[PDB]
Ligand binder design. Structure first.
Ligand SMILES: *[C@@H]1O[C@H](CO)[C@@H](O)[C@H](O)[C@H]1NC(C)=O
Lengths: 213, 219, 196
């Protein structure tokens, strides 16, 4: 079959810059059968370009497609924060195949996270487990270190993280780390702490609470 | 106004069957090329099938012999009949109008989630993440809801019946060791608004028919 | 008294598949040997007849249909096929008695910049009947709003250009097709191979 390989896999560019995305077909396709889609987080794909160079309705001239044969290019000039999305190329001449995608991240100024620690609720403790949640809000870039400490003992194998997709407006990320213990092990210790390392912080920031306080 | 509204997604055991619907408005289904496109969690798009206005149908290699695309003019509705489902059929499925050389896949539906798993439906437990007593971060305070132990995905979380959208972060669900999902939804508000504003999170898990409203209060 | 197969096969430009040409062959001796003994044809599929025998049979009428399609679409010029061409441009019947002949014509039907002569029908509400020919250019109504003869959203011109370029992949290059159908009716036979 016709296989479309997109390059590069990830792009990180500043607003106002230009993004050049490539789609390479394993065999030559007519330009009349190439298409580009944009997919923002939690949304359906949105058609940008059909037929290599033709813009879909409502798509600004800022997007332009080009190419012939085995090689096709999507160019997004004057990048804006809401251009942060996943971009797919597609061919619809010989059957229908898509490329794996290129994830465009939009850079912004370094933003330190705001850290909040949440103790377990009294209702969940009645059930028998204790989930301690750490929140890292509105930060850039994505790389963050969340270290759980219980009575100053570093905790490992104990937690799970979730990162939001990049915000379409302020280009930030948000992270949640959840420490899960049994009610018994939770009542075994006093101080529960969350220590956060990030490029926007000069020294690690610790948010903590004492159990039952 | 042109709209494709999909329904029928849910949980099936392996080898089971499901039927999706795509109700169209502003588009005559029977006059168009209509396609289904699916997206496994975390991966890219994969074409599933197509039906012509004249009635010819075509399918991808991975679904041929098990899927059947069809339509009903009187309801202006596109259908995808899925049989012998396997774990790899787990995906969000989209219906799309197809213009080919005249415009490709120009109109897309919102998608429905399809989960093929032997695991059984489980409704979530909703616990509050209380705002702290020492909320000195700016003037801002963080609060939220912990939605725990559910299968399958998805859960929807709104705040104050949708009237509160600024500062809201609903995190992608994570699969736990138990095989159940869990996520949190947080919101950042001015500290002074605690005491002047009530914050309720509305959690809806349609696969188990569980709606939960949970008031989040300081302390 | 020799059938004018050269007028069909060696014609300077072929018809678009949606407006396929048909030449009625009658009152002549065929000599099919010029065709099947040629190395120029990438496709020579016969149905209901053996090509070797063809110079020893008679038919009451012969039709030669000719057009241009993509190389990937030649597979559709066969009984029981579906797709854009078989559904909306040229439909063979299931009991087709004849031969399908095709050959690459990239040297003749492709132009640098795109050959926008050869068109195909993209939009139609129903599949064609066997040997039906539809040359209408009415605006295709894809939605509920009438078009009133004006292109726009949900109102598309039903034909599309192939845009044959010399550097296309072989499946995207133009192929010239001649479809011979053989009629056998309760009437005098006026087309015969040389041997009979
Ligand atoms: C068509 O032209 C070719 C090229 O010279 C020739 O070899 C062939 O005999 C011709 N066929 C007919 C049927 O006239």
């Amino acid at each position: 079959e016709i296989v479309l390989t997109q390059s590069p896999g990830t792009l990180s560019l500043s607003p106002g810059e230009r993004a050049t995305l490539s789609c390479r077909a394993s065999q030559s396709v007519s330009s009349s059968y190439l298409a580009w889609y944009q997919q923002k987080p939690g949304q359906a794909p949105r058609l940008l370009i059909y037929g290599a160079s033709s813009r879909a309705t409502g798509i600004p001239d800022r997007f332009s497609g080009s190419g012939s044969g085995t090689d096709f290019t999507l160019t997004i000039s004057r990048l804006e924060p809401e251009d942060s999305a996943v971009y797919y190329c597609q061919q619809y001449g010989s059957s229908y195949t898509f490329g794996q995608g290129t994830k465009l991240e939009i850079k912004r100024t370094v933003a330190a996270p705001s850290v909040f620690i949440f103790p377990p609720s009294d209702e969940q403790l009645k059930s028998g487990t204790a989930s301690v949640v750490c929140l890292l809000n509105n930060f850039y870039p994505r790389e963050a270190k969340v270290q759980w400490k219980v009575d100053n003992a570093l905790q490992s194998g104990n937690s799970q993280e979730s990162v939001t997709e990049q915000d379409s407006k302020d280009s930030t990320y948000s992270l949640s780390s959840t420490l899960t213990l049994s009610k018994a092990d939770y009542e075994k210790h006093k101080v529960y702490a969350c220590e956060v390392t990030h490029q926007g912080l000069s020294s690690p920031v610790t948010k903590s609470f004492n159990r039952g306080e | 106004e042109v709209q494709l509204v999909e329904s029928g997604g849910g949980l099936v055991q392996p080898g089971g069957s499901l039927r999706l619907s795509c109700a169209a408005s502003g588009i005559t289904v029977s006059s168009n090329y209509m396609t289904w496109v699916r997206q496994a969690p975390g991966k890219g798009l994969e074409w599933v099938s197509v039906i012509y206005s004249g009635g010819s149908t075509f399918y991808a290699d991975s679904v041929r012999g098990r899927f059947t695309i069809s339509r009903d003019n009187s309801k202006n509705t596109l259908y995808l009949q899925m049989n012998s489902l396997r774990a790899e059929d787990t995906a969000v499925y989209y219906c799309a109008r197809d213009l080919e050389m005249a415009g490709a896949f120009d109109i897309w539906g919102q998608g429905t989630m399809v989960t093929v798993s032997s695991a059984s439906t489980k409704g979530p437990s909703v616990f509050p993440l209380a705002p702290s007593s020492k909320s000195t971060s700016g003037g801002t305070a963080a609060l939220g809801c912990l939605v725990k132990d559910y299968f399958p995905e998805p859960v929807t979380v709104s705040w104050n019946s949708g009237a509160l959208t600024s500062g809201v972060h609903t995190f992608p669900a994570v699969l736990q060791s138990s095989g159940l999902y869990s996520l949190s939804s947080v919101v950042t508000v001015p500290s002074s608004s605690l005491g002047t504003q009530t914050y309720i999170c509305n959690v809806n898990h349609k696969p188990s028919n569980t709606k939960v409203d949970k008031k989040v209060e300081p302390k | 008294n020799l059938c004018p197969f050269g007028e069909v096969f060696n014609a300077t430009r072929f018809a678009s598949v949606y407006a396929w040409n048909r030449k009625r062959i009658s009152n002549c001796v065929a000599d099919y040997s010029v065709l099947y003994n040629s190395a120029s044809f990438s496709t020579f599929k016969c149905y209901g007849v053996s090509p070797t025998k063809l110079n020893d049979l008679c038919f009451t009428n012969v039709y030669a249909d000719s057009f241009v399609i993509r190389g990937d679409e030649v597979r559709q010029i066969a009984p029981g096929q579906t797709g854009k061409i078989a559904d909306y441009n040229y439909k063979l019947p299931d009991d087709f008695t004849g031969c399908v002949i095709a050959w690459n014509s990239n040297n003749l039907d492709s132009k640098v910049g795109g050959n926008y002569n050869y068109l195909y029908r993209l939009f139609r509400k129903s599949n064609l009947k066997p040997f039906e020919r539809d040359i209408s250019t009415e605006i295709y109504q894809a939605g509920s709003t009438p078009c009133n003869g004006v292109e726009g959203f949900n109102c598309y011109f039903p034909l599309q250009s192939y845009g044959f370029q010399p550097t296309n992949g072989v499946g995207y290059q133009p192929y010239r097709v001649v479809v011979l159908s053989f009629e056998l009716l309760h009437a005098p036979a006026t087309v015969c191979g040389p041997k009979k």
